């Protein structure tokens, strides 16, 4: 019922500004805010306090704390997250690069 | 007593490795159990500038202990003095512990003269070793050249540095052995 | 030592190089590159066996420049110095420090601070030799050393000797 | 050093291409020069196959009929060969064969054995001392007897 | 051969070694002979997609 | 030990470094071949931006004031300690003497250039052996 | 001109990862370091005239790796370096 | 499509009984704990 | 445009974020850093061995850079150190170690309570880190005395204090009351005697975190590459502000070694320790609340490494 009556505050936002937004994009911000249980804000308080990697959340807002923490708590980063592949400067998991080209040496014959 | 070649021990010591001031603290400190700090500079007419560095070196040294005893006498004066004590098995410690080292010290400085086998370089003043010598090797020339300066090194270390190794050894080992044996006397008790 | 070990590199081959015929081409790279050369991890590579049965795997293509990336998995017969190993030798340079013993593809020096006190070092004669009790230390003469130490750099490996000990020297 | 502790990848336990489990294989300068001379034959053949669409002079000639065969780039393997032919007194391998006989009988390492037949020693001392690794691990007078065997082994040529 | 002054020209060659030679003061050379494997940094001419934005 | 870099061009190596020096396009290049010899070439007029070797010669300081959200018990305690740690270093003289000649300046409306003149003088005789006195008045004046 | 945070974000809508890379690395500055395989911090001293390379303070002549990243991520990274935390790099993942 | 919809969102924003617009949203996105008009539809 | 290496190119996969040790600081670090100049005393090269020596990095493209040589547009850098005499805290971590203080004896070095408390045993199922450290930091900062035997076990029994942040330290209140000032050495020692089940179970990796590490023993020295000074009209030349924090923490530390070295006034030695420890905060972060801002002689605020990564437009 959370999750519905969310989807329904922020579509009648839309509708009063007399404007039509697809059902797909704001399906998926909903879902994104009750994916955890709950509510979830929108905030640098609302996924910069969960894990998604130390630069990841870094980048956002408060730097300096979450590096901090991040070298005293020993954490570890994955490092396939959107700004840390671009921080790192080389290809990101995201369209084009979301997938490895190859070559089959058994089609060169043909 | 045991307790007596504890204080030979400690006289032997300050007086064989530090100056005379060291032993007139300590033997301040050996005639009365609780030497106040206006005491000993009355005693020996030092400033507290002088007074202050030889309390530090025997307190360093983990010789001597000090209790800053408190003090509400006559005019409500928080007069506080700075009593110091022997600290007799500290000191046997640091006393062994430094011989200890003193030994090691001087093992190590032998085996290094027993065999020549750096270089160095008197052009750009840097050190080189025999692997860096043969990794500096050409076949054009018939010497070890310097990567810094491309030009033949000297042979570092020899045979004559040997001989100071061993009369530090030796006499190293003159100069501490009633030290040691003292050492040996006073462990015999634990005390 | 000359020991026999499978080893695995990364062949990069240049897009023009895509023909039927490539695998060819790879053992080709595979030659070249691997005899003769040497590694620190591995030591002077000598030799590379089974040539035949080589595996090619699958052929990866890197972003940029478009060149091919390929891992190859093969037998190689490679030669690694260890520290405290007696081989034989023959001298090549000679120098006051020492005599430079070549032992296969590996230059050995030998310290004359390593030697015995009655080798000496005589440059009247030519080429200058080393002169002992015994025992005269030539070019062409083999010598027996005994390594004592060994340095693993990256495509350069170089070891130091010695011959103070018993049952060693000149052969 | 030389205490039966080498590196990572030489040590006792390696590990094929195929994935099992394989012993470190130490080779001495005996066979190290009929396997090298052996593989570099069928190099010959396999540089001669694809082309169609008295000890020191017949050493050299074959490193050079095996030089023309390589891109000019590797011959340290062929003063390599020169090297051990020159400090080789086995041949042929079925000697080699018993010559592994009369190593693996004893029961040692294979870097041990590869020194031992590696070197030319007379008595039980020159082996104990040339190899460190080798002082109580097995008998002196059986020792004595690999080398009495090895010494009617050898042969001038 | 036209030169950087003219539009339909270059500026800048890379050879196949990794080193670029500006086609300033190369005139004073005389001739510039182009190989294979080379890069040659040409003008923004016809039919070349650019991408194009306004902020924000 | 060396560490002198010098550029030459390679294909040209006729002459010393006869070179120009492109700022627009931040390049170096040989002006013969036209060769480029560097690239990437950086400024010294952009890092001056954000910004006296002469008189203070290499010595560094930094103030300590009071902070935005601070308190007065802090600011005495590290002002008292620089007061103990200002013997370490014998140049209190220069700032007090510049000082007082810096109001003796300002008090006779002299130009800055015979400001500058006047502490450069009197940094040349500081404190040397044959002055041996005259109680700082002499010197200033 | 600057390519701001926005742009970016669309070029990420956009879908288009190799523009991305080449107008943050190639258009703008590109820089070339070596890691160290046990500790993956950047104090590999790199004398590659002789092609020689070591890492101070653990013992390593051999493993020594190669990557290209921007320069201010360098000046991040030495910047953590300086503020007592150690951004370590490492090629192979170990968490699998 | 995180992208896609933050920008299907944030597009319509410019554009602009209950509190409608550029607070009401903000108080969506935010989660606050109190509206500006907490009103019901009882049916 | 820059030369080719031999060494094998990959890509930056896993990154891990951690604490430098004192002694991997050392074992990076070349130079000691001991002079509080910039450059020589002949006005020119640099002054070999202080804040700005040919033993870290350099530029204005000439000069070489003695210790990786190749040139500036190739130098990563060099770092240098600095070995102090007094530990000093790290402003990121003041809470954090309060947090310590607060959630393990002051004398045996022993967690409060035990697993043989119920509420122990629900807090140490939880798998995340903070939360854990979060939870047990709830239930020992309650208990404020160790005890010997607990019924169904360390000694110590020491009534354990109020730990309190106060102007960059730690006041402990005894109620016994005996209220007695925590300093930094006695806190490192504390951290000394932590087992590894305890600080294993607070959120630390032995291989990474330690909480002795979170103590400043040693200071790294980052090189100009990172504070690129500047020589302009060669007699108006600018350092960074990092550079005269460089140079405030070498006044402070000999100073303090100084003071500690003849006599012992008791007062001065802690106003040097404070002042030290105030040039070590100020350099690590300027902008630290309830502490004096230290302000350049221009008339501007000291530039930290912080103030480089909190505000916009920044290095993020
Ligand atoms: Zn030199
Ligand atoms: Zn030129
Ligand atoms: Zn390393
Ligand atoms: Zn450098
Ligand atoms: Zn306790």
Redesign the pocket.
Same mark, same amino acid.
Request: proline share 4%; net charge neutral; aromatic share 6%.
């Given at each position: 019922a959370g999750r519905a009556a969310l989807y329904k505050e922020v579509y009648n936002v839309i509708a009063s500004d007399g404007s039509y937004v697809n059902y797909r994009h704001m399906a998926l911000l909903v879902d994104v805010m009750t994916t955890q249980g709950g509510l979830t804000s929108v905030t640098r308080h609302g996924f910069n306090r969960s894990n998604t990697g130390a630069l990841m959340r870094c980048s956002f807002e408060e730097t300096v704390e979450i590096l901090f923490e991040a070298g005293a708590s020993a954490e570890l980063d994955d490092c396939r997250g959107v700004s840390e592949n671009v921080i790192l400067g080389q290809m990101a998991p995201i369209g084009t690069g979301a997938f490895d080209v190859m070559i089959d040496e058994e089609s060169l014959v043909k | 007593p045991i307790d007596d070649i504890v204080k030979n021990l400690l006289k032997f010591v300050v007086r064989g490795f530090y100056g005379g001031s060291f032993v007139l603290v300590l033997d301040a400190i050996l005639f009365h159990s609780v030497l106040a700090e206006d005491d000993l500079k009355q005693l020996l007419s030092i400033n507290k500038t002088e007074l202050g560095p030889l309390i530090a070196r025997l307190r360093s040294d983990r010789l001597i202990s000090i209790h800053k005893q408190r003090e509400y006498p006559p005019n409500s004066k928080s007069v506080e003095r700075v009593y110091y004590y022997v600290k007799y098995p500290h000191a046997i410690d640091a006393i062994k512990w430094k011989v200890h080292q003193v030994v090691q010290r001087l093992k190590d400085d032998l085996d290094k003269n027993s065999e020549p086998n750096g270089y160095m370089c008197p052009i750009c003043l840097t050190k080189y070793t025999q692997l860096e010598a043969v990794q500096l090797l050409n076949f054009d020339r018939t010497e070890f050249l310097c990567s810094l300066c491309d030009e033949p090194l000297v042979e570092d270390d020899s045979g004559k540095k040997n001989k100071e190794k061993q009369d530090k050894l030796n006499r190293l080992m003159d100069q501490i052995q009633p030290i040691i044996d003292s050492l040996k006397k006073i462990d015999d008790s634990r005390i | 030592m000359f020991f026999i070990k499978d080893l695995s590199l990364n062949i990069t081959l240049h897009p023009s190089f895509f023909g039927p015929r490539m695998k060819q081409y790879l053992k080709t790279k595979l030659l070249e590159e691997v005899e003769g050369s040497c590694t620190g991890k591995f030591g002077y590579i000598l030799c590379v066996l089974d040539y035949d049965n080589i595996d090619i795997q699958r052929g990866r293509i890197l972003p940029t420049d478009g060149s091919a990336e390929f891992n190859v998995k093969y037998r190689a017969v490679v030669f690694k110095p260890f520290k405290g190993e007696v081989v034989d030798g023959t001298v090549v340079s000679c120098s006051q420090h020492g005599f430079e013993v070549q032992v296969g593809p590996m230059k050995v020096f030998v310290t004359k601070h390593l030697m015995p006190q009655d080798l000496t070092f005589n440059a009247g004669s030519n080429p200058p030799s080393y002169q002992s009790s015994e025992d005269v230390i030539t070019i062409k003469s083999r010598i027996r050393v005994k390594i004592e130490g060994c340095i693993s750099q990256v495509s350069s490996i170089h070891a130091i000797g010695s011959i103070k000990e018993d049952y060693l020297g000149a052969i | 050093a030389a205490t039966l502790q080498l590196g990572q990848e030489f040590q006792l336990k390696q590990i094929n291409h195929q994935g099992e489990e394989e012993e470190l294989i130490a080779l001495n300068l005996s066979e190290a020069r009929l396997v090298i001379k052996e593989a570099l034959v069928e190099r010959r053949r396999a540089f001669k196959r694809s082309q169609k669409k008295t000890r020191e002079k017949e050493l050299e000639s074959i490193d050079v009929l095996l030089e023309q065969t390589t891109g000019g780039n590797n011959k340290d393997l062929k003063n390599t060969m020169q090297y051990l032919t020159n400090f080789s007194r086995f041949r042929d391998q079925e000697t080699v064969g018993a010559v592994i006989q009369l190593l693996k009988s004893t029961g040692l390492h294979p870097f041990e054995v590869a020194q031992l037949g590696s070197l030319a020693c007379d008595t039980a001392d020159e082996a104990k001392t040339l190899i460190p690794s080798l002082n109580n691990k097995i008998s002196d007078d059986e020792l004595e007897r690999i080398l009495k065997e090895l010494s009617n082994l050898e042969t001038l040529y | 051969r036209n030169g950087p002054n003219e539009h339909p020209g270059a500026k800048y060659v890379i050879r196949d070694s990794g080193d670029r030679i500006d086609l300033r003061y190369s005139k004073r050379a005389g001739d510039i002979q182009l190989q294979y494997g080379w890069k040659v940094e040409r003008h923004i001419m016809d039919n070349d997609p650019v991408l194009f934005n306004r902020q924000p | 030990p060396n560490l002198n870099i010098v550029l030459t061009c390679p294909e040209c190596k006729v002459y010393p470094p006869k070179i120009v020096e492109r700022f627009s396009e931040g390049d170096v290049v040989c002006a013969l071949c036209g060769l480029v010899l560097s690239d990437k070439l950086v400024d010294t007029r952009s890092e001056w931006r954000t910004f006296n070797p002469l008189l203070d010669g290499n010595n560094l300081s930094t103030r300590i004031g009071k902070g935005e959200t601070t308190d007065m018990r802090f600011t005495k305690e590290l002002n008292k300690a620089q007061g103990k740690n200002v013997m370490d270093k014998k140049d209190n003289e220069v700032q007090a003497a510049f000082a007082k000649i810096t109001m003796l300046c300002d008090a006779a409306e002299l130009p800055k250039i015979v400001k500058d003149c006047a502490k450069e003088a009197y940094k040349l005789c500081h404190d040397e052996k044959t002055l041996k006195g005259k109680s700082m008045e002499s010197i200033m004046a | 001109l600057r390519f701001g945070e926005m742009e970016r974000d669309c070029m990420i809508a956009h879908g288009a990862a190799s523009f991305l890379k080449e107008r943050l690395m190639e258009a703008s500055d590109a820089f070339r370091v070596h890691i160290? +395989?046990? $500790?993956g911090?950047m104090?590999?001293i790199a004398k590659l005239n002789h092609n020689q390379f070591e $890492?101070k +303070? $653990?013992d390593?002549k051999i493993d020594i790796y190669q990557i290209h990243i921007p320069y201010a991520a360098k000046l991040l990274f030495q910047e953590l370096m300086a503020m007592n935390i150690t951004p370590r790099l490492y090629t192979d993942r170990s968490r699998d | 499509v995180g992208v896609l919809a933050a920008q299907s969102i944030g597009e319509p924003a410019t554009q602009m009984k209950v509190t409608s617009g550029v607070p009401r949203l903000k108080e969506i996105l935010n989660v606050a704990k109190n509206m500006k008009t907490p009103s019901l539809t009882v049916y | 445009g820059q030369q080719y290496s031999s060494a094998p190119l990959r890509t930056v996969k896993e990154v891990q974020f951690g604490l430098f040790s004192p002694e991997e600081v050392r074992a990076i670090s070349v130079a000691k850093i001991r002079f509080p100049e910039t450059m020589d005393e002949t006005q020119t090269r640099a002054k070999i061995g202080g804040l700005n020596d040919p033993r870290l990095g350099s530029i204005d493209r000439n000069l070489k850079c003695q210790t990786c040589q190749e040139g500036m547009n190739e130098c990563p850098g060099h770092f240098g150190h600095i070995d102090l005499a007094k530990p000093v805290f790290h402003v990121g971590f003041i809470a954090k170690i309060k947090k310590v203080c607060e959630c393990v004896c002051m004398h045996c070095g022993k967690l409060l309570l035990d697993e043989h408390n119920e509420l122990m045993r629900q807090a140490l199922a939880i798998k995340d880190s903070k939360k854990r450290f979060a939870a047990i930091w709830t239930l020992c900062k309650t208990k404020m005395v160790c005890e010997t035997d607990v019924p169904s076990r360390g000694g110590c029994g020491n009534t354990q204090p109020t730990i309190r942040k106060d102007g960059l330290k730690l006041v402990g209140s005894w109620k016994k009351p005996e209220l007695r000032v925590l300093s930094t050495e006695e806190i490192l020692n504390i951290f000394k005697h932590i087992s590894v089940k305890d600080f294993t179970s607070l959120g630390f990796n032995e291989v990474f975190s330690r909480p002795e590490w979170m103590i400043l023993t040693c200071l790294p020295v980052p090189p100009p590459p990172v504070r690129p000074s500047i020589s302009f009209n060669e007699s108006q030349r600018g350092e960074d502000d990092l550079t005269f924090k460089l140079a405030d923490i070498l006044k402070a530390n000999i100073s303090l070694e100084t003071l500690e070295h003849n006599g012992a006034p008791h007062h001065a030695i802690e106003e040097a320790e404070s002042l030290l420890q105030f040039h070590v905060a100020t350099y690590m972060d300027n902008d630290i609340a309830g502490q004096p801002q230290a302000l350049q002689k221009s008339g501007r605020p000291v530039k930290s490494i912080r103030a480089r990564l909190k505000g916009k437009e920044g290095r993020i």
């Amino acid at each position: 019922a959370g999750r519905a009556a969310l989807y329904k505050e922020v579509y009648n936002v839309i509708a009063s500004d007399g404007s039509y937004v697809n059902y797909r994009h704001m399906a998926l911000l909903v879902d994104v805010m009750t994916t955890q249980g709950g509510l979830t804000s929108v905030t640098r308080h609302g996924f910069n306090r969960s894990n998604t990697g130390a630069l990841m959340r870094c980048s956002f807002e408060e730097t300096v704390e979450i590096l901090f923490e991040a070298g005293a708590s020993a954490e570890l980063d994955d490092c396939r997250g959107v700004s840390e592949n671009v921080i790192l400067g080389q290809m990101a998991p995201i369209g084009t690069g979301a997938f490895d080209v190859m070559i089959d040496e058994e089609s060169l014959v043909k | 007593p045991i307790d007596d070649i504890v204080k030979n021990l400690l006289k032997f010591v300050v007086r064989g490795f530090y100056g005379g001031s060291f032993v007139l603290v300590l033997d301040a400190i050996l005639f009365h159990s609780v030497l106040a700090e206006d005491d000993l500079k009355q005693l020996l007419s030092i400033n507290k500038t002088e007074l202050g560095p030889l309390i530090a070196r025997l307190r360093s040294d983990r010789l001597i202990s000090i209790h800053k005893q408190r003090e509400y006498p006559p005019n409500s004066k928080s007069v506080e003095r700075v009593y110091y004590y022997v600290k007799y098995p500290h000191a046997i410690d640091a006393i062994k512990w430094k011989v200890h080292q003193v030994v090691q010290r001087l093992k190590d400085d032998l085996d290094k003269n027993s065999e020549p086998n750096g270089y160095m370089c008197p052009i750009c003043l840097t050190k080189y070793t025999q692997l860096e010598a043969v990794q500096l090797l050409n076949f054009d020339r018939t010497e070890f050249l310097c990567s810094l300066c491309d030009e033949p090194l000297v042979e570092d270390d020899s045979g004559k540095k040997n001989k100071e190794k061993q009369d530090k050894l030796n006499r190293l080992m003159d100069q501490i052995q009633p030290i040691i044996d003292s050492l040996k006397k006073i462990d015999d008790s634990r005390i | 030592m000359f020991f026999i070990k499978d080893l695995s590199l990364n062949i990069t081959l240049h897009p023009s190089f895509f023909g039927p015929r490539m695998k060819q081409y790879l053992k080709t790279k595979l030659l070249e590159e691997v005899e003769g050369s040497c590694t620190g991890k591995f030591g002077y590579i000598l030799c590379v066996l089974d040539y035949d049965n080589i595996d090619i795997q699958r052929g990866r293509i890197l972003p940029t420049d478009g060149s091919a990336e390929f891992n190859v998995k093969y037998r190689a017969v490679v030669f690694k110095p260890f520290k405290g190993e007696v081989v034989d030798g023959t001298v090549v340079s000679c120098s006051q420090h020492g005599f430079e013993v070549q032992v296969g593809p590996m230059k050995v020096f030998v310290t004359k601070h390593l030697m015995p006190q009655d080798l000496t070092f005589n440059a009247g004669s030519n080429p200058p030799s080393y002169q002992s009790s015994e025992d005269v230390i030539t070019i062409k003469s083999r010598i027996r050393v005994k390594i004592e130490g060994c340095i693993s750099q990256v495509s350069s490996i170089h070891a130091i000797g010695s011959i103070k000990e018993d049952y060693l020297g000149a052969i | 050093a030389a205490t039966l502790q080498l590196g990572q990848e030489f040590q006792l336990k390696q590990i094929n291409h195929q994935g099992e489990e394989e012993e470190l294989i130490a080779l001495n300068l005996s066979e190290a020069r009929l396997v090298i001379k052996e593989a570099l034959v069928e190099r010959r053949r396999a540089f001669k196959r694809s082309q169609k669409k008295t000890r020191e002079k017949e050493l050299e000639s074959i490193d050079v009929l095996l030089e023309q065969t390589t891109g000019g780039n590797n011959k340290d393997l062929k003063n390599t060969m020169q090297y051990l032919t020159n400090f080789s007194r086995f041949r042929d391998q079925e000697t080699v064969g018993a010559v592994i006989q009369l190593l693996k009988s004893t029961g040692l390492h294979p870097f041990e054995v590869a020194q031992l037949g590696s070197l030319a020693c007379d008595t039980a001392d020159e082996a104990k001392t040339l190899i460190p690794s080798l002082n109580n691990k097995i008998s002196d007078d059986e020792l004595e007897r690999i080398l009495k065997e090895l010494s009617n082994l050898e042969t001038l040529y | 051969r036209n030169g950087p002054n003219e539009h339909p020209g270059a500026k800048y060659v890379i050879r196949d070694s990794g080193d670029r030679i500006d086609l300033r003061y190369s005139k004073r050379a005389g001739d510039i002979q182009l190989q294979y494997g080379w890069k040659v940094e040409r003008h923004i001419m016809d039919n070349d997609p650019v991408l194009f934005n306004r902020q924000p | 030990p060396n560490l002198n870099i010098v550029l030459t061009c390679p294909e040209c190596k006729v002459y010393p470094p006869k070179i120009v020096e492109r700022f627009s396009e931040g390049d170096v290049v040989c002006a013969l071949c036209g060769l480029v010899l560097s690239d990437k070439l950086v400024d010294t007029r952009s890092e001056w931006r954000t910004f006296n070797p002469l008189l203070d010669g290499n010595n560094l300081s930094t103030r300590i004031g009071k902070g935005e959200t601070t308190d007065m018990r802090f600011t005495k305690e590290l002002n008292k300690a620089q007061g103990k740690n200002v013997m370490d270093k014998k140049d209190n003289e220069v700032q007090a003497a510049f000082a007082k000649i810096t109001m003796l300046c300002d008090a006779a409306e002299l130009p800055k250039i015979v400001k500058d003149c006047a502490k450069e003088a009197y940094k040349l005789c500081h404190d040397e052996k044959t002055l041996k006195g005259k109680s700082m008045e002499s010197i200033m004046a | 001109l600057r390519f701001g945070e926005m742009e970016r974000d669309c070029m990420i809508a956009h879908g288009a990862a190799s523009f991305l890379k080449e107008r943050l690395m190639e258009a703008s500055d590109a820089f070339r370091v070596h890691i160290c +395989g046990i $500790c993956g911090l950047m104090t590999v001293i790199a004398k590659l005239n002789h092609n020689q390379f070591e $890492c101070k +303070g $653990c013992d390593n002549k051999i493993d020594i790796y190669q990557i290209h990243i921007p320069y201010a991520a360098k000046l991040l990274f030495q910047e953590l370096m300086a503020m007592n935390i150690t951004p370590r790099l490492y090629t192979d993942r170990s968490r699998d | 499509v995180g992208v896609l919809a933050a920008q299907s969102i944030g597009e319509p924003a410019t554009q602009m009984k209950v509190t409608s617009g550029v607070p009401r949203l903000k108080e969506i996105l935010n989660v606050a704990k109190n509206m500006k008009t907490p009103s019901l539809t009882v049916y | 445009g820059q030369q080719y290496s031999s060494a094998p190119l990959r890509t930056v996969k896993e990154v891990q974020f951690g604490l430098f040790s004192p002694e991997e600081v050392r074992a990076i670090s070349v130079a000691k850093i001991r002079f509080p100049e910039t450059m020589d005393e002949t006005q020119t090269r640099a002054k070999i061995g202080g804040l700005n020596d040919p033993r870290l990095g350099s530029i204005d493209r000439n000069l070489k850079c003695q210790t990786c040589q190749e040139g500036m547009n190739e130098c990563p850098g060099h770092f240098g150190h600095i070995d102090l005499a007094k530990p000093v805290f790290h402003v990121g971590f003041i809470a954090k170690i309060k947090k310590v203080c607060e959630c393990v004896c002051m004398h045996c070095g022993k967690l409060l309570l035990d697993e043989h408390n119920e509420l122990m045993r629900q807090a140490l199922a939880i798998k995340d880190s903070k939360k854990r450290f979060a939870a047990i930091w709830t239930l020992c900062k309650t208990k404020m005395v160790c005890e010997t035997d607990v019924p169904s076990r360390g000694g110590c029994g020491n009534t354990q204090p109020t730990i309190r942040k106060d102007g960059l330290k730690l006041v402990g209140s005894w109620k016994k009351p005996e209220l007695r000032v925590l300093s930094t050495e006695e806190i490192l020692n504390i951290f000394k005697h932590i087992s590894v089940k305890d600080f294993t179970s607070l959120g630390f990796n032995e291989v990474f975190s330690r909480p002795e590490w979170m103590i400043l023993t040693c200071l790294p020295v980052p090189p100009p590459p990172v504070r690129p000074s500047i020589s302009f009209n060669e007699s108006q030349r600018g350092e960074d502000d990092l550079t005269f924090k460089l140079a405030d923490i070498l006044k402070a530390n000999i100073s303090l070694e100084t003071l500690e070295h003849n006599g012992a006034p008791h007062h001065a030695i802690e106003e040097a320790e404070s002042l030290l420890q105030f040039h070590v905060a100020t350099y690590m972060d300027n902008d630290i609340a309830g502490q004096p801002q230290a302000l350049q002689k221009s008339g501007r605020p000291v530039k930290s490494i912080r103030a480089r990564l909190k505000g916009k437009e920044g290095r993020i």
